[PDB]
Design a binder for these strands. Sequence first.
RNA 1: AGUAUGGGAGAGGAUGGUAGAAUUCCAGGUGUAGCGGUGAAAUGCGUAGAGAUCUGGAGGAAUACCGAUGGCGAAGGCAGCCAUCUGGCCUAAUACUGACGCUGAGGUACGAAAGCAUGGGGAGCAAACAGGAUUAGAUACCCUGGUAGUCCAUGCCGUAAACGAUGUCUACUAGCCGUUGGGGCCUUUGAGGCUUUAGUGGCGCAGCUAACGCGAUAAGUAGACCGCCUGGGGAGUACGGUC
Lengths: 117, 52, 63, 104, 88
Amino acid sequence: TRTVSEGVAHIHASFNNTIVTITDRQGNALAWATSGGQGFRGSRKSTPFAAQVAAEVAGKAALDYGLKNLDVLVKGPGPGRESAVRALGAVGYKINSITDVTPIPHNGCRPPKKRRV
Amino acid sequence: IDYKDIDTLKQYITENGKIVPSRITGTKARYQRQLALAIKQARYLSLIPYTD
Amino acid sequence: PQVKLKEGEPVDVAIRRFKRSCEKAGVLADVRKREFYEKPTQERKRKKAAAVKRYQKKLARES
Amino acid sequence: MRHYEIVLLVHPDQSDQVVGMVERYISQIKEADGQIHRLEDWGRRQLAYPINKIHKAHYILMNVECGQSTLDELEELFRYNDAIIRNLIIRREHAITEESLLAK
Amino acid sequence: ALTNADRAEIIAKFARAENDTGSPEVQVALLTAQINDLQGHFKAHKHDHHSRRGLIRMVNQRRKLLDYLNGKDHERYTALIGALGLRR
RNA sequence: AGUAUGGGAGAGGAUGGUAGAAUUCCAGGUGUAGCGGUGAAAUGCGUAGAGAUCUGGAGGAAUACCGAUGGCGAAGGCAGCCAUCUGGCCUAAUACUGACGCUGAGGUACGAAAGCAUGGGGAGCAAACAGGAUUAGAUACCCUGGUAGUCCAUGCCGUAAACGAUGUCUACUAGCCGUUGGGGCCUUUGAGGCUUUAGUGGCGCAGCUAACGCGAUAAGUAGACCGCCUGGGGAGUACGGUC
């Protein structure tokens, strides 16, 4: 219905899963994909392959909205960030910027205890 | 050094807005302490950003 | 960061440049440190060992 | 009798009243005791980060010397004034009168 | 606190000679003035132990000087403690 | 050994205010099938809409970068910024007092964390506890939740591998390389180089040591005073007493 030419891609990468969300500016969502949705159940969610396939799914869905240039923001550690941004370019989008925006506390709340494995 | 010398203050700030260690610029310790104090005062006065 | 793009900059080269910028910023190191809580005793021991290693490196590079 | 340096941020919508604010402040300080050793107006500067969704403000600097009661009442007025969104007060040694940088 | 004029007043009053700033009378008077002055501070800041240590140091120094003066000359000791109001 | 006058550095202490990042919760906009978690899973959350993303509120606790084998403090300890009150230390030259000193049985003051009492507060974390896993069994290590507590005001308790496993004070005894706060001198225009002093580190001669090692910050050469030891267990235990 709505036509948008430029948008933002948010990548939430962790040690367990990666989420790719396509939004317009001002922060309204358009489409989103995840490793769990494209199979890769369980431990497989963290592999770069799942990240790349999820990114391709998200880009293909956004092309229906019909935008070409997007800005990429990466938040979180974990593999598949570079794979995800590469896949977004591979769908033929023009990336306008790519930034690292993981939040950092100024010595705030106490973290959980260390694991004795 | 005072908090009004914004140009010299930015001379010792990275692009993220963080203070540069004295190892990188060869500054003396006494000057570095005053520099950090002035940088924090300027941040509070909002002449320079906290982050970015 | 904010890795903006030239007209001729390829996606792969842009991503490599962005990786270099993130590694220079060292945000992931702070993210890793924030994950688990470290006792002040452990922090002091780690810093003492790091200082010893740095002084040994300086002595080795001087002589 | 101590020396202080004061920085005040004023809402630009109330920059037309800054003359009244400064005149009454300096008049009170003077009729109590002490002198004003510098008055400076940097103008309507842009902010590095917004405060209360405000992106620009008027900067006034005062280098004064006064007493404890005067300092208390200045704190009182600065706190319960509304055009003043931020202030900084710093104890100083020696009197500063020279044209400071960035004042222009 | 005490100022230069305040200290000079006590020094001039209790001095035993010209430029006499080292006499036991002068030292005890200065310590007494400082101790009486700090009582106001320690009423409002009862949990300031780090400064109370310095206060006890002042008290002990005053006691040692008084004992030395009493050993040297009894009349000067009595006159000084009478003038300063100390009970011993 | 101490006093007066000028100058200097500091997360030294107490009181009050204030700033920014982040976690949690709440309301709302976009938007739709998963999210979360592990070695692998499961418990758990979600189609009365989660997670993701954007805006706006509430509250508590802690202060990234600077940051350092750095600094301050008797020790325990002390880190955002500002003001008020306040202790000690370093440094120059004169002036002043004239042994006023050192140590210290009893005594007294301070003294991490946990804990206790009365009243508040409660984001995050988390003894006890509940559930899910692993295992021959699991009462644990792992996962999801979670109360006291951690925070504040006023008191108590008086213990730690409270450690440099090294009581306090004084004098003397090759050198080499760092660093912090001052003083002086010399270059010659501004940044360097020599000295001296009080701290804080790395090697090392003599000497010492069972050896490891210490070595001007002695565990060397001597002096003053105090505390403590006398095979391993029973035992820092029993009885008596003080708190």
